[PDB]
Amino acid sequence: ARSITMQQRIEFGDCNPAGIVWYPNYHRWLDAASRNYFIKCGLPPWRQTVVERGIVGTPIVSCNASFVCTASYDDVLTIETCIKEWRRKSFVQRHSVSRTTPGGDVQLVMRADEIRVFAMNDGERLRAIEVPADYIELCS
Amino acid sequence: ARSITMQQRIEFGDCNPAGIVWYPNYHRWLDAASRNYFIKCGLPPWRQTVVERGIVGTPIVSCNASFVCTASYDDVLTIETCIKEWRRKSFVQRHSVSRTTPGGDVQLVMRADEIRVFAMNDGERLRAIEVPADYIELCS
Amino acid sequence: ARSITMQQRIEFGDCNPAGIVWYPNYHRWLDAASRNYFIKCGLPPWRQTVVERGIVGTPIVSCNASFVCTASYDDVLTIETCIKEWRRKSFVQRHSVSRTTPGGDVQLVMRADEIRVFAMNDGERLRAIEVPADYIELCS
Amino acid sequence: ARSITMQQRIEFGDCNPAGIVWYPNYHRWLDAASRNYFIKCGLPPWRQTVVERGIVGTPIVSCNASFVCTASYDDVLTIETCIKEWRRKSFVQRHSVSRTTPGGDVQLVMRADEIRVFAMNDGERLRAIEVPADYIELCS
Ligand SMILES: CC(C)(COP(=O)(O)OP(=O)(O)OC[C@H]1O[C@@H](n2cnc3c(N)ncnc32)[C@H](O)[C@@H]1OP(=O)(O)O)[C@@H](O)C(=O)NCCC(=O)NCCSC(=O)c1ccc(O)cc1
Ligand SMILES: CC(C)(COP(=O)(O)OP(=O)(O)OC[C@H]1O[C@@H](n2cnc3c(N)ncnc32)[C@H](O)[C@@H]1OP(=O)(O)O)[C@@H](O)C(=O)NCCC(=O)NCCSC(=O)c1ccc(O)cc1
Ligand SMILES: CC(C)(COP(=O)(O)OP(=O)(O)OC[C@H]1O[C@@H](n2cnc3c(N)ncnc32)[C@H](O)[C@@H]1OP(=O)(O)O)[C@@H](O)C(=O)NCCC(=O)NCCSC(=O)c1ccc(O)cc1
Ligand SMILES: CC(C)(COP(=O)(O)OP(=O)(O)OC[C@H]1O[C@@H](n2cnc3c(N)ncnc32)[C@H](O)[C@@H]1OP(=O)(O)O)[C@@H](O)C(=O)NCCC(=O)NCCSC(=O)c1ccc(O)cc1
């Protein structure tokens, strides 16, 4: 479907002693890409949404992650994001990370399908909401 | 099976603007717990292993993550680790995160089954190895 | 003066390819220790303070950092915190990090004096306030 | 002197509950900018240097940090790096972070002078070296 693409440079800080990306970092980039998607789709900043209709953002309730091959500093990553499926209060967000070999070949590094929702904070308690119609439409 | 348990305090740094743990952090704690397991099982530090038999550590090739309920700073987390299954070159490592309500009730926060391996770095290239026998035994 | 002490274990995630703590992590622990200080001194959680008298927390306006010797995973750090000086709207918070040699010797790893304040968020704008009297007193 | 410039986007992950950049993140970007400088100056990757002449990288022995004004997600940062002074085994690396107001005005966010060195790892022990001549020259 509607797919967004953002790039990400691997920094020395991002790798472990074994000298390859430390995994959590992928999550950090994913959460980035995630938001990036929606922004680039026309949804206002959370900051704003929380004031207009109480949406804080989109919490992750589930995720299936897969690490195909290693990466390291200097490598530049490409992250393909798209909405896999719209459920009721949930939605599938797929992201595919890859890197380029100097041969112009593109190698899948990692992939992940994260299941998120749009939520509100009724005080201290986080609560999911029915994916908003308008949202759908912008993302379309 | 053989299960290890370690605790983790949520720091203000660990939460987002929405005021709850930022997810990647869970991964960070998981990777911690992961290693903690093996250490507490008697395997020497990677540092050492890489010199004695070239093992750098245990890279993650797969993971299924689930966020049951929110957490925030000050909360103290309990992380239950264990080896779910030994395959050939792979192994299932399960971790269950929970927190305690002042009612002495324990609430599942998040869970994850990560699939890892023991590996070597043949130069620049990461390569998995057959789970080491002795390792098995210590973990038993 | 009134000094608080908290410990911190170095995780594999925390070190770089060079195999020693990655510096930013120190900051993370410092910010921890920082808050820890106040909590352990009796000040309620920010969460609370922001509702009772609008204090969000204590932003850092300045810091002088010094890295004496290296650290790495497995090492356990000890962080000594105390209020060096109370100014008007500012205050000096000193922290001294050290580790123990198996000889029972304690080696200074790193130190830092961070200058913070107590603040409010008048909408989008962050604003410092006169250190609160009561606070002083608890910290005393 | 020779000054390098790199940009950095603030991600939701990067901010705290108070809704502004969490400080350690600045350090992360600084360390980035730091390396970026040298790379863009023509020095090969550490990876390489450690094999050719044993240089692992450039550890930080000191830093003076200053936070002028707040930043938050979405903001795009500009980081100006340059070598302030070459000492013997040390060197001053200055970085100036700023952001742009929609008025086309540029506002200093934060600054820092970090004192680094070029080092080697004689086994487990980190040791500084005399800034390398050639390096100087490239950076010039
Ligand atoms: C979000 C929740 C409150 C939702 O609970 P509820 O309000 O009671 O409603 P529901 O249970 O019906 O959940 C709504 C949907 O999620 C689905 N869901 C819930 N759990 C699952 C799992 N495990 N798998 C698949 N789908 C799931 C559920 O089935 C619903 O789908 P629909 O049928 O289409 O309606 C609760 O699951 C929760 O709080 N989970 C923990 C959240 C958490 O800690 N996430 C990690 C931190 S958040 C974060 O990092 C972040 C970053 C950036 C952002 O923009 C936002 C958040
Ligand atoms: C690790 C690998 C080199 C293994 O490849 P190979 O050497 O060629 O062998 P194999 O393909 O046969 O994989 C070995 C096993 O993994 C299994 N595997 C591989 N992919 C999968 C997936 N996706 N699901 C399940 N099982 C899998 C595979 O089927 C084998 O199981 P066995 O049948 O029991 O042998 C390669 O998959 C790889 O490099 N993946 C990318 C690794 C990566 O980038 N991980 C993220 C960073 S590592 C990290 O954060 C870390 C932290 C702390 C540490 O201690 C270590 C590492
Ligand atoms: C905090 C500020 C709004 C204060 O500005 P103002 O409200 O206009 O008042 P002031 O300028 O008078 O500052 C108050 C005091 O700070 C002092 N100050 C300010 N800058 C400096 C520097 N550079 N050195 C020393 N002292 C300083 C100032 O001189 C005042 O001291 P007093 O004389 O005793 O009153 C503004 O400096 C600012 O926003 N700086 C940027 C803040 C920032 O981005 N910090 C990084 C992120 S915050 C963070 O990580 C965090 C973590 C955990 C928490 O609990 C809270 C925050
Ligand atoms: C680096 C050191 C081994 C140097 O010690 P030595 O080899 O014995 O030599 P020296 O003491 O003479 O230090 C060399 C220079 O540093 C100077 N130095 C040392 N401490 C200071 C302080 N506090 N202020 C100013 N200058 C200092 C020293 O005076 C020398 O300058 P010259 O006179 O010009 O020679 C030791 O100070 C050390 O290990 N400090 C701790 C290092 C540390 O833990 N840094 C944090 C983690 S590293 C990191 O995050 C990183 C990221 C990215 C990278 O590329 C590299 C590293």
Short mmCIF file of C-alpha atoms in Angstrom, two decimals, chain A residues 4-71:
data_model
loop_
_atom_site.label_atom_id
_atom_site.label_comp_id
_atom_site.label_asym_id
_atom_site.label_seq_id
_atom_site.Cartn_x
_atom_site.Cartn_y
_atom_site.Cartn_z
CA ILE A 4 7.08 5.82 3.05
CA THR A 5 10.81 5.69 2.92
CA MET A 6 13.38 7.07 5.26
CA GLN A 7 17.18 6.50 5.59
CA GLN A 8 19.29 5.92 8.67
CA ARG A 9 23.05 6.17 9.29
CA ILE A 10 24.72 3.78 11.62
CA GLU A 11 26.82 5.40 14.22
CA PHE A 12 29.70 3.95 16.15
CA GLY A 13 27.57 4.52 19.27
CA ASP A 14 24.93 2.15 17.78
CA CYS A 15 27.25 -0.91 17.71
CA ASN A 16 28.30 -3.29 20.42
CA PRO A 17 31.70 -4.67 21.28
CA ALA A 18 31.08 -7.39 18.67
CA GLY A 19 31.10 -4.50 16.31
CA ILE A 20 27.61 -4.61 14.80
CA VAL A 21 24.48 -2.80 15.36
CA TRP A 22 23.08 -3.35 18.87
CA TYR A 23 19.48 -4.52 18.30
CA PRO A 24 17.54 -2.16 20.40
CA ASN A 25 18.71 0.51 18.08
CA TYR A 26 16.64 -1.03 15.27
CA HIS A 27 13.57 -0.60 17.44
CA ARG A 28 14.55 3.06 17.96
CA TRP A 29 14.80 3.53 14.23
CA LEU A 30 11.48 1.65 13.69
CA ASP A 31 9.61 3.78 16.12
CA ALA A 32 11.09 6.68 14.10
CA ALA A 33 10.07 5.38 10.82
CA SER A 34 6.74 4.64 12.30
CA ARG A 35 5.96 8.16 13.26
CA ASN A 36 7.69 9.49 10.13
CA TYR A 37 5.09 7.58 8.18
CA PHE A 38 2.16 9.35 9.72
CA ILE A 39 3.74 12.65 9.65
CA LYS A 40 4.55 12.36 6.00
CA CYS A 41 1.03 11.24 5.55
CA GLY A 42 -0.36 14.46 6.91
CA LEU A 43 -1.20 13.75 10.46
CA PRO A 44 -0.27 16.50 12.79
CA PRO A 45 2.26 16.05 15.60
CA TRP A 46 1.18 14.13 18.64
CA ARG A 47 1.75 17.34 20.61
CA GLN A 48 -1.08 18.81 18.68
CA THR A 49 -3.32 15.76 18.52
CA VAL A 50 -3.35 15.36 22.23
CA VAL A 51 -4.79 18.85 22.52
CA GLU A 52 -7.27 18.57 19.78
CA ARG A 53 -8.71 15.21 20.31
CA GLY A 54 -6.67 13.67 23.03
CA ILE A 55 -4.57 11.36 20.98
CA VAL A 56 -1.20 10.91 22.57
CA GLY A 57 0.19 8.72 19.84
CA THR A 58 0.41 5.10 18.77
CA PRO A 59 1.50 2.53 21.25
CA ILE A 60 2.87 -0.83 20.20
CA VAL A 61 0.98 -3.88 21.53
CA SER A 62 2.82 -6.42 19.40
CA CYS A 63 5.83 -7.03 17.22
CA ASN A 64 7.51 -9.76 15.08
CA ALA A 65 11.07 -9.00 14.38
CA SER A 66 13.64 -10.57 12.07
CA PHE A 67 17.36 -9.97 11.68
CA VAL A 68 18.52 -11.18 8.22
CA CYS A 69 22.10 -9.92 8.17
CA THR A 70 24.41 -7.65 10.09
CA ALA A 71 25.03 -3.93 9.85
#
